[PDB]
Design a protein around this ligand. Sequence first.
Ligand SMILES: CS(=O)(=O)N1CCO[C@H](c2csc(-c3cc(N4CCOCC4)ccc3NC(=O)c3ncc[nH]3)n2)C1
Length: 240
Amino acid sequence: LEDVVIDRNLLILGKILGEGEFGSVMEGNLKQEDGTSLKVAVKTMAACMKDFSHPNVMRLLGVCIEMSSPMVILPFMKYGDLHTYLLYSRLETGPKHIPLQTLLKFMVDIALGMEYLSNRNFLHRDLAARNCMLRDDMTVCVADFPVKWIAIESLYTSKSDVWAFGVTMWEIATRGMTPYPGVQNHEMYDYLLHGHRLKQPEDCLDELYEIMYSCWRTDPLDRPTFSVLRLQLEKLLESL
Ligand SMILES: CS(=O)(=O)N1CCO[C@H](c2csc(-c3cc(N4CCOCC4)ccc3NC(=O)c3ncc[nH]3)n2)C1
């Protein structure tokens, strides 16, 4: 089924950007049909992605299969994963102090991305700040289609995706804290069973904590939809 394939000679691979599940993600140059070349990311060593068109969801540029003796091509995200970008924001090199409105925009971006995928009845199954990438224009898009992001009942529906989104909201609000400090992975199921949740971050609004807390209700049906979540975050952002 090769409607999305690209000729291998149009692609030039280069240095490593990160490590995915099945192999290395490399930087690359893709020669386009209009003659010009574009910087790309190439996972090495997709059917879902072909069906997606939305700003806050990573798109498929193509596929290549080189023979030795496959590679999925994706857009280059110049600031990398969101988790690592948040960590750097607490030091002094690349980005400055990120204000509250910019963190909410990251949350809104992800919510929009998930709203779209949720309407297609597509389940992410791995939503986290490390799986959210940063475009050259500072917009976030969800990508990659881990015990502390999985919900109670899942130990998967669209509401277990909502749980993981709440955890990702917490990650962004804490600027890259690992969830559940002083709690081990084996310990999680019982920690959640007794009704304990991620604690409210430091200088973080009650309105915001209400929203992320609502993602972790015991009953999946009590959680809000991504569209409900998206509006709550958008209106909270507007009130600053
Ligand atoms: C969630 S994912 O499935 O996308 N995934 C999984 C495996 O690890 C990959 C990863 C980690 S860090 C990184 C990256 C880092 C930089 N940086 C290099 C160091 O300085 C800042 C920019 C620049 C570009 C980068 N990636 C991309 O453009 C790109 N697009 C599409 C897939 N990957 N990529 C990402």
